[PDB]
Coordinates of C-alpha atoms (C1' of nucleotides) and ligand atoms in Angstrom, one line a residue:
Chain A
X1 CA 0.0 0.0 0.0
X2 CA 1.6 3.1 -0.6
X3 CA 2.4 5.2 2.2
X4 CA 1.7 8.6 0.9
X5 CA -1.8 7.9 -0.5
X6 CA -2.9 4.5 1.2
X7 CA -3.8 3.0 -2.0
X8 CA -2.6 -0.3 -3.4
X9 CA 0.2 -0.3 -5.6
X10 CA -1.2 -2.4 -8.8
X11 CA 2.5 -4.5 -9.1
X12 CA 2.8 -6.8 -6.2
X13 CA 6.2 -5.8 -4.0
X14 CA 8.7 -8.3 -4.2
X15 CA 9.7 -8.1 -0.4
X16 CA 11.4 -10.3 2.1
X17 CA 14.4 -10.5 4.7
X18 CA 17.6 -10.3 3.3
X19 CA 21.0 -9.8 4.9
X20 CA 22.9 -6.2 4.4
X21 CA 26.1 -4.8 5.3
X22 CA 27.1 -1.5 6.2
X23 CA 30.3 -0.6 3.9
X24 CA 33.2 1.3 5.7
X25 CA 32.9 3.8 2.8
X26 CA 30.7 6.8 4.3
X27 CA 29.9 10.3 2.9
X28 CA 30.8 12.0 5.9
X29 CA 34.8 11.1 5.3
X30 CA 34.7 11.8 1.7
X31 CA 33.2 15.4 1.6
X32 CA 35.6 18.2 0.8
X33 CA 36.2 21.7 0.0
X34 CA 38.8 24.0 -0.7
X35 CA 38.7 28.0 -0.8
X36 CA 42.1 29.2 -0.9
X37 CA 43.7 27.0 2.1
X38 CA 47.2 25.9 2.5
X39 CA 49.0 25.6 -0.3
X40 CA 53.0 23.5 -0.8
X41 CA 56.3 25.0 -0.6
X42 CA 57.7 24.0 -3.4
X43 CA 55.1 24.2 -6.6
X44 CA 53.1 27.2 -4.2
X45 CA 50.2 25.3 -5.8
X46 CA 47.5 24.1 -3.7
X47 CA 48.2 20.6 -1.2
X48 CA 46.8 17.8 -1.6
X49 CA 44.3 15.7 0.3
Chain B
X1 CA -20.2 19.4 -1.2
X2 CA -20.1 18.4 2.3
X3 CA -17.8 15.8 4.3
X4 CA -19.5 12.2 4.7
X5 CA -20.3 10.8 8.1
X6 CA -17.9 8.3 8.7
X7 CA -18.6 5.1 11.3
X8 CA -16.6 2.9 13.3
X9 CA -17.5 -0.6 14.4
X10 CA -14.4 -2.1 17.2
X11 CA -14.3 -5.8 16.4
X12 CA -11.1 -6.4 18.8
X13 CA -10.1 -4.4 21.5
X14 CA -6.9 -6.0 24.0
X15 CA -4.5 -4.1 26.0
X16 CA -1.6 -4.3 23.4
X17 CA -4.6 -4.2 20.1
X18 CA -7.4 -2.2 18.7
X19 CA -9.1 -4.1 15.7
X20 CA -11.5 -1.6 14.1
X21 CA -13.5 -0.8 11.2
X22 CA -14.3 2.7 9.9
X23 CA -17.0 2.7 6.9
X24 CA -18.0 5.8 4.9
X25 CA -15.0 7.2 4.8
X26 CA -12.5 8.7 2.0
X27 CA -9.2 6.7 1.2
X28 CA -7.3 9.8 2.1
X29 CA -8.7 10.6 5.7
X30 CA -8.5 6.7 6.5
X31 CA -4.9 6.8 5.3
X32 CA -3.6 9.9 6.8
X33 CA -5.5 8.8 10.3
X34 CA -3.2 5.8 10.2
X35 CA 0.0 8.1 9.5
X36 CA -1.0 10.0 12.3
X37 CA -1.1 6.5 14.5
X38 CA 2.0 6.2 13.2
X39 CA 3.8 9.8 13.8
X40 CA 1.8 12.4 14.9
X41 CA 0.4 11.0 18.0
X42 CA 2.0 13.0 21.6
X43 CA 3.9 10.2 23.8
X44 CA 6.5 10.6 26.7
X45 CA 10.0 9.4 26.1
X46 CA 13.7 10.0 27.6
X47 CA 15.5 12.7 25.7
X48 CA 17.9 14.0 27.7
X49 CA 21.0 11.6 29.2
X50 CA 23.3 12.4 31.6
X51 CA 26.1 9.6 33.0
X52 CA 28.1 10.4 35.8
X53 CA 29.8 6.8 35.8
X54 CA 29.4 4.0 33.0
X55 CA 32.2 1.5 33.5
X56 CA 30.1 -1.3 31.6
X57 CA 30.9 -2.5 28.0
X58 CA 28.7 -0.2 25.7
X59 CA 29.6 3.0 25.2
X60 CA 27.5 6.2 26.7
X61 CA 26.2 7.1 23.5
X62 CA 25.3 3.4 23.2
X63 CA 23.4 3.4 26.7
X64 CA 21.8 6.6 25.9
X65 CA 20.0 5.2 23.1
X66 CA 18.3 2.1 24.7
X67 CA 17.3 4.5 27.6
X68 CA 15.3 6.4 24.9
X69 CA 14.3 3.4 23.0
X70 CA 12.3 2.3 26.3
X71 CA 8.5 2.8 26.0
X72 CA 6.7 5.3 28.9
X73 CA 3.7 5.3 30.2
X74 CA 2.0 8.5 28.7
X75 CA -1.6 7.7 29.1
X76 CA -2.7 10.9 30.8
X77 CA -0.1 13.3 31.6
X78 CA 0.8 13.5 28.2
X79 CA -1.8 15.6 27.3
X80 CA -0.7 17.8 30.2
X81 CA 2.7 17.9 29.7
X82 CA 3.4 20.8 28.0
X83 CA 6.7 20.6 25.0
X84 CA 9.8 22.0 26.2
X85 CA 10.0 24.9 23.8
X86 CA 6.3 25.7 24.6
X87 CA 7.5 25.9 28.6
X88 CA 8.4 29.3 29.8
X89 CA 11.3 27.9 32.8
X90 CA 14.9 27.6 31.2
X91 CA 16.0 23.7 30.1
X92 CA 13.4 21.2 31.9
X93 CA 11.1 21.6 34.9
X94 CA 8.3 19.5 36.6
X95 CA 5.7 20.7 33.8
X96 CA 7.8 19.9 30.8
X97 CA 9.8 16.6 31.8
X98 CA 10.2 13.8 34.2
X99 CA 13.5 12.6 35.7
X100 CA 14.6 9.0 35.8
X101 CA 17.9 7.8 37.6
X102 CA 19.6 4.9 37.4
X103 CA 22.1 3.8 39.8
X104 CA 23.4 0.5 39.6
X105 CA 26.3 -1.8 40.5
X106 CA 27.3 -5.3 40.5
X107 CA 29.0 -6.3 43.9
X108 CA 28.0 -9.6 43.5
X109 CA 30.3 -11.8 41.1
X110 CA 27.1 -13.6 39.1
X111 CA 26.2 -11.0 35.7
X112 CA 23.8 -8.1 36.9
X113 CA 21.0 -7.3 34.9
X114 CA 20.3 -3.8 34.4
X115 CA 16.5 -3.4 33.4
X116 CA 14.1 -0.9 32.9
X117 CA 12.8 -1.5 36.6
X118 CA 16.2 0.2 37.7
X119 CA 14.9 3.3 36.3
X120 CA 13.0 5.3 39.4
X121 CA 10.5 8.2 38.1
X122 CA 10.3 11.6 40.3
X123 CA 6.5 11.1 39.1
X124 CA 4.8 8.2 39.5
X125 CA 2.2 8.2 36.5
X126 CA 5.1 7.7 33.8
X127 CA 7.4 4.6 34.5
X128 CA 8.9 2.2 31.9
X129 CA 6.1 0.3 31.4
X130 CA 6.9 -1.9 34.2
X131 CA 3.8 -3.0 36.5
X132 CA 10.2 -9.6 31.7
X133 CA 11.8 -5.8 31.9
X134 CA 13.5 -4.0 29.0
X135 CA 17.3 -5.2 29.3
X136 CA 18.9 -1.8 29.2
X137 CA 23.2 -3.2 30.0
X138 CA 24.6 -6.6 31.3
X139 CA 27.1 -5.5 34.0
X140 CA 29.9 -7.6 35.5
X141 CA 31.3 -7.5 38.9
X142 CA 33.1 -3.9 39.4
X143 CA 31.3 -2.2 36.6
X144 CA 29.0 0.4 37.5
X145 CA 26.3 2.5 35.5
X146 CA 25.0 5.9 37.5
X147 CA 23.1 8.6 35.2
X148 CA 20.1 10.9 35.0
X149 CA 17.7 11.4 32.6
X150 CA 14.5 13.5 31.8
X151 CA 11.6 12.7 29.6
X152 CA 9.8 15.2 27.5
X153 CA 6.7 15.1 25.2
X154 CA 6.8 14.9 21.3
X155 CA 5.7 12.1 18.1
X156 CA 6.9 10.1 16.2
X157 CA 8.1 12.7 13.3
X158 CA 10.8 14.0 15.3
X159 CA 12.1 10.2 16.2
X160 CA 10.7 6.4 16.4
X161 CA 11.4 6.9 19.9
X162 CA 8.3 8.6 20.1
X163 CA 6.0 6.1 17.9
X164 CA 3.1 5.1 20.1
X165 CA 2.5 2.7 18.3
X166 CA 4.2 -0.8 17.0
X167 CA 2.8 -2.2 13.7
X168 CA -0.7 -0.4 12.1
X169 CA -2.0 -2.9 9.5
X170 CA -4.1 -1.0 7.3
X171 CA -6.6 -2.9 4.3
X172 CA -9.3 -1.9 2.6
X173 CA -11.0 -4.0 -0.4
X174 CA -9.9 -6.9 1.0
X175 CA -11.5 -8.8 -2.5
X176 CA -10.2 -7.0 -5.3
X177 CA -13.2 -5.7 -6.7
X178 CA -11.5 -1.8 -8.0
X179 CA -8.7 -3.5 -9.2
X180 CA -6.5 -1.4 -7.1
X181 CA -3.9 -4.0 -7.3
X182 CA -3.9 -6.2 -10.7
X183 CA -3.0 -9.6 -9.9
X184 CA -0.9 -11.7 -12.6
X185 CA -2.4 -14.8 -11.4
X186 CA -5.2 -14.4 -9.3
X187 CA -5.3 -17.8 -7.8
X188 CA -1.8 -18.2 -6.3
X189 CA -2.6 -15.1 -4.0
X190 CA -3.7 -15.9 -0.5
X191 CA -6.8 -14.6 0.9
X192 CA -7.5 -11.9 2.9
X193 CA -8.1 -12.8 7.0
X194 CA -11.2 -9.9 5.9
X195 CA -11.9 -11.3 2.7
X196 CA -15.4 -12.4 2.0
X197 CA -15.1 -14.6 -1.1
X198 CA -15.8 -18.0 -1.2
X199 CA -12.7 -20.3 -1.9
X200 CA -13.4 -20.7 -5.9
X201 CA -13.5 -17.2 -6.5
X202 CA -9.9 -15.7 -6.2
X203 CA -10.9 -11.6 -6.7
X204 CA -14.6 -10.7 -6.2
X205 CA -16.0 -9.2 -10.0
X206 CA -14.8 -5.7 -10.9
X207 CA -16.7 -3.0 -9.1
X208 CA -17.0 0.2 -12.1
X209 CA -18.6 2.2 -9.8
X210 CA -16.9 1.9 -6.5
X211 CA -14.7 4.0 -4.3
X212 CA -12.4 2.3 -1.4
X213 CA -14.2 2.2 1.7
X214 CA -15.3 0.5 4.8
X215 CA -10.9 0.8 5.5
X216 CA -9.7 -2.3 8.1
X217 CA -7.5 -1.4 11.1
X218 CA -5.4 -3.6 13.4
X219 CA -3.3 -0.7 15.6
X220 CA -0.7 -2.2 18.2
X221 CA 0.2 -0.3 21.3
X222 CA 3.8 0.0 22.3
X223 CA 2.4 -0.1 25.6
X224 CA 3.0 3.6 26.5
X225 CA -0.3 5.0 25.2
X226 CA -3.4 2.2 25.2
X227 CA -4.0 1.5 21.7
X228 CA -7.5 3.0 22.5
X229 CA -6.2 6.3 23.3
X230 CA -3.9 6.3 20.5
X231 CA -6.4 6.3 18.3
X232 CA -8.8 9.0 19.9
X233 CA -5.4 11.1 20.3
X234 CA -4.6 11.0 16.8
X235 CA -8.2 11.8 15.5
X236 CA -7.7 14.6 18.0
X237 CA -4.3 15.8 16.7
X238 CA -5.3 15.4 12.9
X239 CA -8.4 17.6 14.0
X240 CA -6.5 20.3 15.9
X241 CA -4.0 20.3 12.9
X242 CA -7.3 21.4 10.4
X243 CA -7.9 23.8 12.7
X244 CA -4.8 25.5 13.3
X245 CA -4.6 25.7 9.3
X246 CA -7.7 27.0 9.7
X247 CA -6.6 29.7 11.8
X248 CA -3.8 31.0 10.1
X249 CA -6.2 30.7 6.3
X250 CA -8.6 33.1 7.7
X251 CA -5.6 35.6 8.9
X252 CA -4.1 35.6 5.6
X253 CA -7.3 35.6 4.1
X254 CA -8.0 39.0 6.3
X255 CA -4.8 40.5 5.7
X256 CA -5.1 39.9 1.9
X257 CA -8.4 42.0 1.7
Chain C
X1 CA 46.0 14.0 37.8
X2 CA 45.2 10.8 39.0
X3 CA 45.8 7.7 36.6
X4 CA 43.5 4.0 37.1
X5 CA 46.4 1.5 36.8
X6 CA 45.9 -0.9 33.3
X7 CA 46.7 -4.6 35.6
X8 CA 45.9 -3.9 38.8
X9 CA 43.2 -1.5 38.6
X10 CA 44.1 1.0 41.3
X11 CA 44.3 4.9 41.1
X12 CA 48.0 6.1 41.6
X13 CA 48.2 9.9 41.4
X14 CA 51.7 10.5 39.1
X15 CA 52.9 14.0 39.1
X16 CA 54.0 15.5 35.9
X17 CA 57.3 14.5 35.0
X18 CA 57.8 11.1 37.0
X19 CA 57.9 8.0 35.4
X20 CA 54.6 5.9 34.6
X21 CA 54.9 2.9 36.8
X22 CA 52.4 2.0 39.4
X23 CA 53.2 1.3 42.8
X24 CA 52.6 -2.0 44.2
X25 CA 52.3 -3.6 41.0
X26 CA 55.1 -1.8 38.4
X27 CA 53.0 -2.1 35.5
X28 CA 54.1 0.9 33.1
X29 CA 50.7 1.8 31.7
X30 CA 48.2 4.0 33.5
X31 CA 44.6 5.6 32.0
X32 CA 43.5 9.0 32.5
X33 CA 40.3 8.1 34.1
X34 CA 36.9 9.7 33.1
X35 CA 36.2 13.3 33.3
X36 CA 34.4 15.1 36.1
X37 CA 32.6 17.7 34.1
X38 CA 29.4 16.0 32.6
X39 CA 28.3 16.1 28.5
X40 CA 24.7 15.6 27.8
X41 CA 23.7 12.9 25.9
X42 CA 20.6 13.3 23.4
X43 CA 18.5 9.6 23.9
X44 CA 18.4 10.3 19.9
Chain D
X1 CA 25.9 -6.5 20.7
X2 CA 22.9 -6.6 23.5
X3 CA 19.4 -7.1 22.0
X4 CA 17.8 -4.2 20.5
X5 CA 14.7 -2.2 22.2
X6 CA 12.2 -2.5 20.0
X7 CA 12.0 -4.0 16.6
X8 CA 14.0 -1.6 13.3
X9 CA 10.5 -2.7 11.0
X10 CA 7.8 -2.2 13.2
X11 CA 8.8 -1.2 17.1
X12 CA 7.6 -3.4 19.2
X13 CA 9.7 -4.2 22.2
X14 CA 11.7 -6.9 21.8
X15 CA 14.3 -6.2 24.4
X16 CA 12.7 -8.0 27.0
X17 CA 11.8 -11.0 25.2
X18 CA 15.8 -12.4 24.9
X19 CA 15.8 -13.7 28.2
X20 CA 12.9 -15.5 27.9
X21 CA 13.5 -16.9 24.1
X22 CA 16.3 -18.7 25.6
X23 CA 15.3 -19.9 28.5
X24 CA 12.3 -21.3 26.7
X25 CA 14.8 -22.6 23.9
X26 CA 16.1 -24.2 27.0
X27 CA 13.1 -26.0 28.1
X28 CA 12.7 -27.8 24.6
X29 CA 11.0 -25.4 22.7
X30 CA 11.7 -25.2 18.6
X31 CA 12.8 -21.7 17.8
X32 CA 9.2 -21.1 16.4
X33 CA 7.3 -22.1 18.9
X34 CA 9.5 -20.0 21.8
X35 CA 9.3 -17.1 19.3
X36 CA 5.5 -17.9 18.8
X37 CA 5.3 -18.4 23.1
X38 CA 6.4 -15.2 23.2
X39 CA 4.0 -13.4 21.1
X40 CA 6.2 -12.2 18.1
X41 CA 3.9 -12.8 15.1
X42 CA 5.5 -10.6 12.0
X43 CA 8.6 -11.9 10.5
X44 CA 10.2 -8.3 11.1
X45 CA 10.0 -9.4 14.8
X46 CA 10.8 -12.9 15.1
X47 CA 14.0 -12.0 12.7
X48 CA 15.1 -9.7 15.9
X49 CA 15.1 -12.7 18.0
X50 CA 16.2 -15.1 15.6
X51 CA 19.2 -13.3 14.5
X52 CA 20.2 -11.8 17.0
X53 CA 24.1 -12.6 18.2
X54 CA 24.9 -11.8 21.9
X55 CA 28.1 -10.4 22.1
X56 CA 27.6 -8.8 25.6
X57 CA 28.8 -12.4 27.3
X58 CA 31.8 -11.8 25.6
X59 CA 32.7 -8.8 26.0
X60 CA 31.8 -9.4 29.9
X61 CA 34.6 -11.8 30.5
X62 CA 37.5 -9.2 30.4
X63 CA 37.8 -7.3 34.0
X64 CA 36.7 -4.3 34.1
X65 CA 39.1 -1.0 33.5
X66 CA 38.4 0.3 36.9
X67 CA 37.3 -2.3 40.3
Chain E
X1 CA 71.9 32.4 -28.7
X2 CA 74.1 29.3 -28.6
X3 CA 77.9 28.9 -29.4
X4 CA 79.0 25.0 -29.5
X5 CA 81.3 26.3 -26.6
X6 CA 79.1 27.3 -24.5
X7 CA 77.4 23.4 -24.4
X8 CA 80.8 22.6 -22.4
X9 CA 80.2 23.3 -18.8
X10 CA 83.2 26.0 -17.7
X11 CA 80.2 27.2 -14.9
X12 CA 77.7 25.7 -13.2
X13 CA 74.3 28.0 -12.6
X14 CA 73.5 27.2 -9.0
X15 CA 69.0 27.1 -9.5
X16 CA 68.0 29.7 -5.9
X17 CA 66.9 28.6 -2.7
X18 CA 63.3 28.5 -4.4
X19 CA 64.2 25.9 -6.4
X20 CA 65.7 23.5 -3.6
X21 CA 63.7 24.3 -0.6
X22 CA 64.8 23.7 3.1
X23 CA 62.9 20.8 4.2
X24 CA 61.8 22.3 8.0
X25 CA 61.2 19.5 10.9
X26 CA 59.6 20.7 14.1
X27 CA 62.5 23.4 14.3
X28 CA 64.8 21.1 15.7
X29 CA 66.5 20.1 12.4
X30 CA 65.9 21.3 8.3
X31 CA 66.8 18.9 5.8
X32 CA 68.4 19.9 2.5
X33 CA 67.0 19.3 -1.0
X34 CA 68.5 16.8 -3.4
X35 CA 70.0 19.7 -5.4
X36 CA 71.5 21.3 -2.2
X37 CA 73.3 18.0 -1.1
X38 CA 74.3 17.1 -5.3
X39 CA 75.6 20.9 -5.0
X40 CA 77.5 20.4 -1.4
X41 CA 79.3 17.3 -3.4
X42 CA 80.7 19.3 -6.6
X43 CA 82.0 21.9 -4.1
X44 CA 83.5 19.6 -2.6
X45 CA 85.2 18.2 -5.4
X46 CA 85.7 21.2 -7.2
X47 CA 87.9 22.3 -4.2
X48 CA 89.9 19.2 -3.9
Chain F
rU1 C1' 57.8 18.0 6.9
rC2 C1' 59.2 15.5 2.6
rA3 C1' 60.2 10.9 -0.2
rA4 C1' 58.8 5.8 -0.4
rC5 C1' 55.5 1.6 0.2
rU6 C1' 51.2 -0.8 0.6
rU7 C1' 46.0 -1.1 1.0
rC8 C1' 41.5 0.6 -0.9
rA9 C1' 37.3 3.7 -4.1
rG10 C1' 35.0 4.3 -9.0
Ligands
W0F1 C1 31.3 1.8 -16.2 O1 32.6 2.3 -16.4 C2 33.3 2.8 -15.2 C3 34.3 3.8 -15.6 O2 34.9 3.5 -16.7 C4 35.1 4.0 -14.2 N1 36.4 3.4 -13.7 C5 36.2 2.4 -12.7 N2 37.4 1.8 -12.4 C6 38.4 2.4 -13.2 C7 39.8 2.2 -13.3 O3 40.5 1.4 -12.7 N3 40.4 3.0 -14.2 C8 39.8 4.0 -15.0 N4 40.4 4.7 -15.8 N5 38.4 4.1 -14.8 C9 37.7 3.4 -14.0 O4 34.7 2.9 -13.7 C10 34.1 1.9 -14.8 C11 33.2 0.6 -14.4 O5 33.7 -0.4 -13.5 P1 32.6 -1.5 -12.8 O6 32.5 -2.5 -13.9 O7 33.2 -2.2 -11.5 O8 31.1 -0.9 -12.6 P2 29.8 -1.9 -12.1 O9 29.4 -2.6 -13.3 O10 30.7 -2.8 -11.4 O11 28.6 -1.2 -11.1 P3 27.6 -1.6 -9.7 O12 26.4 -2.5 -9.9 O13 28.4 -2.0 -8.5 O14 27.0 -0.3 -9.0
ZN2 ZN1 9.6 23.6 32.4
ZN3 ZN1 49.0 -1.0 39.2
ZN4 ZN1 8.7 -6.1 14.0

RNA sequence: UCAACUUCAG
């Protein structure tokens, strides 16, 4: 049934209990952004990481 | 032009159910009553932890989140409890919360269980549903858990630790007669607990002319709230919610003329 | 401050620069012990 | 770890049912029938119980930091 | 621009301190750049 | 700090 509008989906749900895992990869450690931050001695370029 | 008069007929009603059946009624009020079961019915639950000692293997964080997790009993004050940004006294007061403490340690060398009879209420009308016992830590000899707690009013949007409720089934044509859902094979489909038909006849003939109604519920109570007054607070809340938009309609309305 | 010993499980009180050893049982690694000030934890 | 409160699916409170499911798997129950004894009834629920791992006995055997 | 003498190396340009950083550690010690120690070799030899 | 290495992601 769907949960907005309470009526019956017409395609019957595949649905059942199935075992997941929770990857190490999350978003939290990959989001970045740079705005003119440190930047390396040698190239005076931006550092990376 | 005008709203139909709906009517309910209880089939079931047990301390942890409410079986009911509400005819006359549009798809979308019978729906959205069950989503307010669901989230927008007021319950009492622990949101604010403090540990002064936790020397047992979970984590504070850990603990923090069973303590919440553990149902209340709400049934009255609830509605007299006012929400802690509604209260006028700075953080949490007698009004808007209830403190629970929890001081336990194992002397003894066999395991201690720390359940939810451990926590002691300043008021006596909410306490964890105790009258087994929610298993909150398992502590071993030397290892110590001490921390307060306060319990505030709110629902289920703002977190399931505020759903008053456990599972709402929710089913109406329980023959398919609008077609609602098209069945590949009709006959491999089991049969509705609600369903009328006769055991030939897989789906009941296609209604041209009919609308969803006479909408079956089965509410379960957490145990907080009685799954009576779950149901009576949510028609309530949905009602109070019309209203308020009501309200604020007719200002704008005023202040656009 | 005041360090739980990591064996024997007994608070030695170390001043700053002294070794980290434990009386009565010599084991060379102490914990700082928990904090006295209180955080507030959201049942959430 | 320690068995959840309440059911991820639905939320019933299943927290208080562990002891119980074992001591009744103790008596000679199936796991079915101690999960049905119990009053679990959804497969959401009886999954809590039947997968549930508890670690906590482990992790009680090592002495505590601080006696 | 180019004389086939000149591609016979009678001087050696020395590139600036830009080129071959100090490597800084904590202040207690700065490592030198490739180029510096290479450099600190052919004066070495160049005055033997 | 910089070089090196390995392990991962798509
Ligand atoms: C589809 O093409 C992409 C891209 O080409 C880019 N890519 C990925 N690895 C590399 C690499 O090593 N070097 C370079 N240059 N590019 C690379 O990744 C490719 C696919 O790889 P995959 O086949 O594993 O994608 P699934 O089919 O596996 O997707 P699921 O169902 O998991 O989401
Ligand atoms: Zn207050
Ligand atoms: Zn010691
Ligand atoms: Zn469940």
């Amino acid at each position: 049934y769907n949960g907005f509008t309470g009526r019956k989906i017409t395609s019957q749900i595949f649905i059942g209990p199935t075992y997941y895992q929770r990857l190490k990869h999350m978003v939290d450690d990959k989001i970045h952004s740079r705005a003119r931050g440190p930047i390396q001695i040698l190239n005076r370029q931006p550092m990376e990481g | 032009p005008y709203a139909n008069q709906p009517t309910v007929r209880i089939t079931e009603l047990t301390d942890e159910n409410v079986k009911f059946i509400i005819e006359n009624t549009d798809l979308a009020v019978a729906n959205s009553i069950r989503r307010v079961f669901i989230a927008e019915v007021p319950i009492i639950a622990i949101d604010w932890v403090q540990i002064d000692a936790n020397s047992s293997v979970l984590h504070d964080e850990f603990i923090a989140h069973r303590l919440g997790l553990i149902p209340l009993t709400s049934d009255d004050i609830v509605d007299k409890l006012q929400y802690s940004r509604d209260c006028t006294c700075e953080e949490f007061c007698p009004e808007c919360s209830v403190e629970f403490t929890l001081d336990v340690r194992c002397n003894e060398d066999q395991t201690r269980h720390v359940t939810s009879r451990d926590l002691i209420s300043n008021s006596p009308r909410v306490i964890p549903v105790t009258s087994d016992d929610i298993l909150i830590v398992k502590l071993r000899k030397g290892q110590e858990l001490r921390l307060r707690a306060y319990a505030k009013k709110g629902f289920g949007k703002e977190h399931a630790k505020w759903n008053p409720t456990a599972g709402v089934a929710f089913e109406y044509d329980p023959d398919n007669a609008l077609r609602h859902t098209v069945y590949p094979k009709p006959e491999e489909w089991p049969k509705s607990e609600y369903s009328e038909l006769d055991e030939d006849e897989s789906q009941a003939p296609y209604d041209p002319n009919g609308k969803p109604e006479r909408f079956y519920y089965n509410v379960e109570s957490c145990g907080s709230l009685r799954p009576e007054t779950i149901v009576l607070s949510a028609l309530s809340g949905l009602k109070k919610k019309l209203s308020d938009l009501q309200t604020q309609l007719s200002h704008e309305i005023q202040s656009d003329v | 401050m005041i360090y739980i010993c990591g064996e024997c499980h007994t608070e030695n009180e170390i001043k700053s620069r002294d070794p980290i050893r434990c009386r009565e049982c010599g084991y060379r690694i102490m914990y700082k012990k928990r904090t006295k000030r209180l955080v507030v934890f959201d049942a959430r | 770890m320690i068995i959840p409160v309440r059911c991820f699916t639905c939320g019933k409170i299943v927290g208080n049912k562990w002891e119980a499911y074992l001591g009744l798997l103790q008596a000679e129950y199936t796991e079915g029938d101690a999960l049905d004894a119990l009053g679990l009834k959804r497969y959401c629920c009886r999954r809590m119980l039947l997968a549930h791992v508890d670690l906590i006995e482990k992790l009680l055997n090592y002495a505590p930091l601080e006696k | 621009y180019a004389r086939p003498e000149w591609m016979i190396v009678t001087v050696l340009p020395v590139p600036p301190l830009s080129v071959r950083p100090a490597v800084v550690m904590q202040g207690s010690a700065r490592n030198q750049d490739d180029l510096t120690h290479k450099l600190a070799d052919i004066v070495k030899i160049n005055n033997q």
